[model samples]
Target: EACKFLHQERMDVCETHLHWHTVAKETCSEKSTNLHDYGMLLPCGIDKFRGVEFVCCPL
Candidate 1:
């Protein structure tokens, strides 16, 4: 998938890419942190259009 490529290529932007929403959500949850506490920011994308849209705290 195009997203997969972005994941490897533009990693900085891939994390917030909508394609990785599920991955970010699941991965962030493993950190044992509340979505409201932090990491609940759009990893990338313009506005709320096409982006991961999940909590992805930096590891």
Candidate 2:
């Protein structure tokens, strides 16, 4: 998919990369994020994004 870019609630930017939005939504629904609000395949969750957190610096 070449990684798709999507918009998320301001809170999502800090999220880690491996979690995947769907999983994150289930795991952290307490936050302002959810499965319906953001884009998929974009790595919109904190946990998921955290897994690939290193990518931010490498790229």
Candidate 3:
């Protein structure tokens, strides 16, 4: 699948909003990321491109 780019929300709440939107992607493995797990997400809440916590980076 060439590592599909997806976001994984850690909890259920308003602040859950979103995490990151960038190049490449991560899976449920160590991947060096806490969130954005295989937990699948692409939340589009709040304002336009808003509701995100941090920038999507790679390890």
The prediction achieving the highest lDDT against the true structure is 1
Q: Looking at model 2, which ten-residue stretch has the lowest summed lDDT? A: 50-59
Predicted structure 1: lDDT: 0.38
TM-score of model number 3? 0.19
For model 3, the stretches where C-alpha displacement exceeds 4 angstroms are 16-29, 32-59
Query: Which candidate gets the maximum TM-score versus the true structure?
Result: 1
CA-only RMSD, every prediction: 10.6, 12.5, 8.2
lDDT of 1 by residue, 1-59 (tens): 11111121233453433444555555556765333222224334444323333433443
Model 2, 4-33: lDDT tens digits are: 223333344545443445444553344333
lDDT for model 3 comes to 0.34
lDDT of 3 by residue, 1-59 (tens): 13334433434443332233331132323455433432224444653232233323343
TM-score (all chains, Cα) for each model: 0.28, 0.20, 0.19
Give the true-structure RMSD of model 3. 8.2
What's the lDDT for all of these models?
A: 0.38, 0.35, 0.34
